[PDB]
Design an enzyme around this catalytic site. Structure first.
Site, PDB file in Angstrom:
ATOM      1  NE  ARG B  13      -3.504  -0.434   2.834  1.00 39.87           N
ATOM      2  CZ  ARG B  13      -4.729  -0.007   2.516  1.00 39.87           C
ATOM      3  NH1 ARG B  13      -5.451  -0.624   1.570  1.00 39.87           N
ATOM      4  NH2 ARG B  13      -5.227   1.042   3.185  1.00 39.87           N
ATOM      5  CB  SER B 135      14.154  15.505   5.860  1.00 34.31           C
ATOM      6  OG  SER B 135      13.599  14.627   4.893  1.00 34.31           O
ATOM      7  CG  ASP B 141      -6.206  11.049   9.032  1.00 35.18           C
ATOM      8  OD1 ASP B 141      -6.901  11.801   8.309  1.00 35.18           O
ATOM      9  OD2 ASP B 141      -6.613   9.894   9.372  1.00 35.18           O
ATOM     10  CE1 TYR B 154      -5.085   6.367  12.206  1.00 40.51           C
ATOM     11  CE2 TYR B 154      -6.858   8.043  12.116  1.00 40.51           C
ATOM     12  CZ  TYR B 154      -5.708   7.461  11.566  1.00 40.51           C
ATOM     13  OH  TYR B 154      -5.195   7.956  10.393  1.00 40.51           O
ATOM     14  CE  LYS B 158      -2.032   8.467  11.257  1.00 37.25           C
ATOM     15  NZ  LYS B 158      -0.706   7.904  10.788  1.00 37.25           N
TER      16      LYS B 158
HETATM   17  N1  LIG Z   1      -4.993   4.786   3.450  1.00 42.65           N
HETATM   18  C1  LIG Z   1      -5.570   5.988   3.680  1.00 42.65           C
HETATM   19  O1  LIG Z   1      -6.705   6.401   3.015  1.00 42.65           O
HETATM   20  C2  LIG Z   1      -4.988   6.949   4.686  1.00 42.65           C
HETATM   21  C3  LIG Z   1      -5.738   8.067   5.148  1.00 42.65           C
HETATM   22  C4  LIG Z   1      -5.192   8.930   6.099  1.00 42.65           C
HETATM   23  C5  LIG Z   1      -3.925   8.693   6.620  1.00 42.65           C
HETATM   24  N2  LIG Z   1      -3.210   7.605   6.159  1.00 42.65           N
HETATM   25  C6  LIG Z   1      -1.891   7.314   6.732  1.00 42.65           C
HETATM   26  O2  LIG Z   1      -0.956   6.949   5.741  1.00 42.65           O
HETATM   27  C7  LIG Z   1      -0.138   5.859   6.226  1.00 42.65           C
HETATM   28  C8  LIG Z   1      -0.223   4.682   5.245  1.00 42.65           C
HETATM   29  O3  LIG Z   1      -1.585   4.270   5.161  1.00 42.65           O
HETATM   30  P1  LIG Z   1      -1.943   2.773   4.721  1.00 42.65           P
HETATM   31  O4  LIG Z   1      -3.405   2.753   4.586  1.00 42.65           O
HETATM   32  O5  LIG Z   1      -1.036   2.330   3.656  1.00 42.65           O
HETATM   33  O6  LIG Z   1      -1.603   2.020   6.078  1.00 42.65           O
HETATM   34  P2  LIG Z   1      -2.018   0.565   6.554  1.00 42.65           P
HETATM   35  O7  LIG Z   1      -2.076  -0.253   5.321  1.00 42.65           O
HETATM   36  O8  LIG Z   1      -3.229   0.641   7.428  1.00 42.65           O
HETATM   37  O9  LIG Z   1      -0.786   0.110   7.517  1.00 42.65           O
HETATM   38  C9  LIG Z   1       0.532   0.180   6.988  1.00 42.65           C
HETATM   39  C10 LIG Z   1       1.368  -0.865   7.695  1.00 42.65           C
HETATM   40  O10 LIG Z   1       1.487  -0.469   9.032  1.00 42.65           O
HETATM   41  C11 LIG Z   1       2.096  -1.582   9.666  1.00 42.65           C
HETATM   42  N3  LIG Z   1       1.636  -1.792  11.044  1.00 42.65           N
HETATM   43  C12 LIG Z   1       0.360  -1.857  11.571  1.00 42.65           C
HETATM   44  N4  LIG Z   1       0.458  -2.171  12.894  1.00 42.65           N
HETATM   45  C13 LIG Z   1       1.786  -2.321  13.216  1.00 42.65           C
HETATM   46  C14 LIG Z   1       2.504  -2.677  14.391  1.00 42.65           C
HETATM   47  N5  LIG Z   1       1.938  -2.946  15.575  1.00 42.65           N
HETATM   48  N6  LIG Z   1       3.882  -2.732  14.314  1.00 42.65           N
HETATM   49  C15 LIG Z   1       4.571  -2.495  13.150  1.00 42.65           C
HETATM   50  N7  LIG Z   1       3.887  -2.162  12.000  1.00 42.65           N
HETATM   51  C16 LIG Z   1       2.520  -2.123  12.039  1.00 42.65           C
HETATM   52  C17 LIG Z   1       1.651  -2.845   8.887  1.00 42.65           C
HETATM   53  O11 LIG Z   1       2.779  -3.592   8.429  1.00 42.65           O
HETATM   54  P3  LIG Z   1       2.693  -5.195   8.215  1.00 42.65           P
HETATM   55  O12 LIG Z   1       1.692  -5.401   7.094  1.00 42.65           O
HETATM   56  O13 LIG Z   1       4.090  -5.630   7.763  1.00 42.65           O
HETATM   57  O14 LIG Z   1       2.198  -5.895   9.433  1.00 42.65           O
HETATM   58  C18 LIG Z   1       0.812  -2.298   7.722  1.00 42.65           C
HETATM   59  O15 LIG Z   1       1.048  -2.920   6.460  1.00 42.65           O
HETATM   60  C19 LIG Z   1      -0.607   5.547   7.650  1.00 42.65           C
HETATM   61  O16 LIG Z   1       0.160   6.314   8.533  1.00 42.65           O
HETATM   62  C20 LIG Z   1      -2.030   6.096   7.653  1.00 42.65           C
HETATM   63  O17 LIG Z   1      -2.515   6.549   8.923  1.00 42.65           O
HETATM   64  C21 LIG Z   1      -3.718   6.737   5.225  1.00 42.65           C
HETATM   65  N1  LIG Z   2      -6.505   2.490   5.853  1.00 38.60           N
HETATM   66  C1  LIG Z   2      -5.930   3.260   6.798  1.00 38.60           C
HETATM   67  N2  LIG Z   2      -4.886   2.785   7.534  1.00 38.60           N
HETATM   68  C2  LIG Z   2      -4.308   3.575   8.484  1.00 38.60           C
HETATM   69  N3  LIG Z   2      -3.255   3.082   9.195  1.00 38.60           N
HETATM   70  N4  LIG Z   2      -4.801   4.825   8.700  1.00 38.60           N
HETATM   71  C3  LIG Z   2      -5.825   5.291   7.953  1.00 38.60           C
HETATM   72  N5  LIG Z   2      -6.321   6.541   8.139  1.00 38.60           N
HETATM   73  N6  LIG Z   2      -6.401   4.494   6.999  1.00 38.60           N
END
Ligand SMILES: NC(=O)c1ccc[n+]([C@@H]2O[C@H](COP(=O)([O-])OP(=O)(O)OC[C@H]3O[C@@H](n4cnc5c(N)ncnc54)[C@H](OP(=O)(O)O)[C@@H]3O)[C@@H](O)[C@H]2O)c1
Ligand SMILES: Nc1nc(N)nc(N)n1
Ligand SMILES: NC(=O)c1ccc[n+]([C@@H]2O[C@H](COP(=O)([O-])OP(=O)(O)OC[C@H]3O[C@@H](n4cnc5c(N)ncnc54)[C@H](OP(=O)(O)O)[C@@H]3O)[C@@H](O)[C@H]2O)c1
Ligand SMILES: NC(=O)c1ccc[n+]([C@@H]2O[C@H](COP(=O)([O-])OP(=O)(O)OC[C@H]3O[C@@H](n4cnc5c(N)ncnc54)[C@H](OP(=O)(O)O)[C@@H]3O)[C@@H](O)[C@H]2O)c1
Ligand SMILES: NC(=O)c1ccc[n+]([C@@H]2O[C@H](COP(=O)([O-])OP(=O)(O)OC[C@H]3O[C@@H](n4cnc5c(N)ncnc54)[C@H](OP(=O)(O)O)[C@@H]3O)[C@@H](O)[C@H]2O)c1
Ligand SMILES: Nc1nc(N)nc(N)n1
Ligand SMILES: Nc1nc(N)nc(N)n1
Ligand SMILES: Nc1nc(N)nc(N)n1
Lengths: 249, 248, 248, 249
Positions: B13, B135, B141, B154, B158
């Protein structure tokens, strides 16, 4: 019948001012404390001499741990045990000290600074809601979160998480009729350890009167937010800082 | 030689997209993972096929605990061992799930949500700075002020991460270490989310009625680590297609 | 001696409730109006029945123009002529209507929306300070970061008013004049509006699924001018029942 | 067909750096100016020497008045007249001077400060949208809007209104594929009229290197926002301030 409030860290300084003002407004109060037992009991004694059976103390460490949820549950239970209700929670207790990035372990610092400023308020909020008229929670925030003290990262993180809680809990608890607000002092009562020269440095920064807020002035904003004059206010953080946060470097 | 970056939660992702783009820009990369070993190693294999010995993996749980400081020290150390330097840290790993106020215990929820989103970023930041165009980029978020219902932990995590971004930018400026954030709105939707709810979210976004690609999020990271951002510190760049501007 | 307050746009709705609550608190009041003479006078007559010689009305257009400074000086001067002092200024009067980007000319729209919401408050602030528990309360808007579609000029005016509140708080603090704002979310709905459209807004509000009463907005103004707010300057109190916290 | 950009106040300093970098990136440019005719023409000469028929000047006063709409319309028209298209608008021109609350009349100060910083950008945005790929607008904001300079109320009001315009226009123009963003300098090129002792005081305040931003460093954030690497970014303001706004009083 008289409403009841829990004030955390209420033995002295701002917490005591809040407890006193709530009491003067007609509340029964739980004076929570951690180390300041003599000061807590002395305050309770004074309040009870004013009106019998209207103040109790409740000791708890609010450092994060696996038992912190039980401790926070118990603080709310103490108010119901003493007074049969709990209308207001004021999250005032707070650890405050530097944690530079470059004899406490870092684990301990995280547990104390994030526990007292954010996780305990969260747990106390859960217990307050689950146990449940003009119900509200007031969180003691910090007007300087965006212009923080150098080397206070964990403290700053905690106060930021407390803004997040204020918003999230206001949104979620609004259907139960529980309002959730904050009061954000700039400089109020300076630390007891601070030398006068250093205090004056801070005082001279404040546009409105070149002086720190009194504890009573912080308490005034808390009293406003719990009152019927704020019954539509939720998710709001009232800065009480005499303009300090407006002043550029 | 080439600069080196650590990306947490880089197997899938958004993390993966960020690791790929840094690598494509010329970085050597430490691909951190917790549960996704296979995906982490597959990404490493792909990047090393492109340029030999420029990608390594590093397993660690980022849940808050007594061992978290040591774990964070070792993630940073792994970059120095593999590549002899660590120029960039990207705090991307993140737990995300509801914690209603009214079968994980609450303390486990605190540990995971505040651990991944805030405490781990803090410890990794300490370790990264202690070991020193440097950096750090924190994945924030854009919806922090208009949060998901029943996501208080959560959201606290953030918000704390915004606090760390500001505090660390201020304190690490003298060392020439910039500290910034990228705040997605809706990017890749959760795998568990049903396609009807995914469509409800997409339809909310003013700019194109769609979610951001992972690559669009990575673009802002690449900007922030680049020489085009050398005066930028303590800044959080929203990448949300106007979602946060839309009233209830 | 009783203190005195100027309230702009005080004939109806929120400005009337502010004027009434100030009067109940012991202030003498200048009831400024633009078009609503009958309502302004009826309020004045009511207040004067309560306490003789404690309310006067003051007509003025607050549209931007080369006579606006003199009009604003005259409004302040009216309070001094009536009551010998001016303790409180409430900037409440406000034009509010869409100005899409893509029969009023655009320059008239600019003059009305920016003049009422920003420039008139600015000039009235100048005149109030030049003439000196003194305070100014600006009526802002909790939704300025999540604005109504196609209300750019209105939104610009309200954002400029936040800038004024901060800049005036900073600059007037040495004179002991506090400057604050109250930011409603949804309060009294437009009189035009169908109940079905009114209910759409009501349903968005977490706290009670209803709009704020004018009296609830007034309660926040009363707090801000009171001795309980003596250290508060440069603050904007949201009075929105959680509306601004609700994502799209 | 190369894209085309309008940059207001582009004869000198930051606007000049923006015009130059846009041109280097491949854009044809309208160099708007008010009083700096020699500088504007000299810049256009340099750009055209590099690639012929890629730069024109356009003179206009952006003070608020009843003819401000026509002047703004004309600036946009000049881009279509020279280049047959208008892809990017950069709202850079700005009056900046104190206006204390306690030889210009106040009417003039409102017109110049609110006109240049807010109303001209609004009318230019309107004309840009109405005349309509990777379309976008970038507004030059100010990182210090919440910690303003003493006695700069009208300037601050103008910059706050520009934040409002950025958000409102990003929202409304999103369905047309026009993105609207801002760049917010802290301390960049200091005022020509500022004494050297004062410039040095400012420089010393900036955590990241104790120096002001170059015009080029400000331009870099503008070119990022107009670029394909910002295609999902709208309603964002990027601070480019070296940490200055993070430093308490
Ligand atoms: N996706 C969105 O629409 C969105 C929106 C707002 C903010 N964000 C931010 O952008 C970033 C990336 O988002 P994403 O959706 O790609 O994230 P995600 O898929 O929810 O999580 C990314 C990775 O975080 C790792 N993780 C979760 N729990 C963990 C733990 N206890 N220890 C170590 N690693 C752990 C996992 O790695 P493993 O798979 O190897 O276990 C997972 O693949 C995050 O910070 C998220 O809050 C995303
Ligand atoms: N899908 C998702 N995963 C994380 N870690 N945080 C947010 N906002 N969305
Ligand atoms: N004072 C200021 O200028 C200022 C400025 C900005 C924000 N604030 C905020 O306003 C609130 C009140 O400020 P203050 O200066 O009065 O606070 P404070 O004196 O520093 O601390 C208040 C109380 O917090 C309690 N506390 C500390 N660690 C604890 C722990 N591990 N478990 C349980 N309780 C613990 C202590 O109780 P015991 O003494 O009984 O151990 C202490 O008396 C705080 O939230 C603060 O962050 C204050
Ligand atoms: N109502 C809400 O839900 C809401 C939401 C957010 C913020 N607010 C703010 O709260 C305040 C009060 O709101 P409201 O709904 O009561 O206001 P409103 O009814 O829309 O307008 C208040 C008064 O403003 C005066 N006004 C309009 N144009 C003027 C002009 N050119 N010159 C002089 N005065 C002029 C009018 O006076 P005359 O009738 O005498 O002509 C009008 O009665 C405003 O600042 C508003 O933006 C209200
Ligand atoms: N410099 C900084 O440290 C700093 C800090 C924060 C924000 N900013 C923002 O960044 C942008 C660029 O800054 P800067 O210092 O380069 O700007 P500046 O030199 O102060 O102004 C740039 C141009 O604005 C034009 N201008 C002024 N009044 C005008 C009017 N009435 N009509 C038409 N044009 C007018 C002038 O054009 P002519 O010379 O042709 O008359 C001037 O060269 C501005 O929006 C500024 O507010 C800069
Ligand atoms: N807990 C606490 N927080 C602050 N900001 N100041 C003091 N003295 N204590
Ligand atoms: N002036 C004004 N402003 C708002 N926001 N709403 C209404 N009804 N009027
Ligand atoms: N127009 C303008 N604005 C700022 N903030 N600084 C300078 N030098 N000019």
């Amino acid at each position: 019948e008289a409403p009841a409030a829990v004030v955390t860290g209420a033995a002295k300084r701002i917490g005591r001012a809040i407890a006193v003002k709530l009491h003067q407004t007609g509340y029964r109060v739980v004076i929570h404390y951690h180390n300041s037992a003599e000061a807590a009991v002395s305050l309770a004694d004074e309040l009870n001499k004013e009106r019998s059976n209207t103040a109790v103390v409740c000791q708890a460490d609010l450092t994060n741990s696996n038992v912190l949820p039980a401790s926070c549950e118990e603080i709310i239970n103490s108010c119901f045990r003493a007074f049969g209700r709990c209308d207001v929670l004021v999250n005032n207790a707070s650890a405050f000290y530097p944690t530079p990035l470059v004899g406490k372990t870092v684990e301990t610092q995280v547990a104390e600074l994030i526990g007292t400023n954010a996780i305990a308020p969260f747990l106390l909020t859960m217990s307050f809601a689950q146990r449940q008229s003009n119900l509200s929670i007031v969180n003691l925030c910090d007007a300087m979160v965006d212009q923080p003290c150098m080397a206070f990262s964990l403290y700053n993180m905690g106060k930021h998480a407390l803004v997040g809680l204020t918003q999230s809990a206001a949104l979620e608890l609004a259907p139960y009729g529980i309002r959730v607000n904050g009061v954000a002092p700039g400089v109020s009562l300076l630390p007891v350890a601070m030398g006068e020269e250093e205090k004056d440095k801070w005082r001279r920064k404040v546009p409105l009167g070149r002086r720190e807020a009194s504890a009573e002035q912080i308490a005034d904003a808390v009293i406003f937010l719990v009152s019927g004059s704020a019954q539509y206010i939720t998710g709001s953080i009232i800065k009480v800082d005499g303009g300090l946060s407006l002043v550029h470097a």
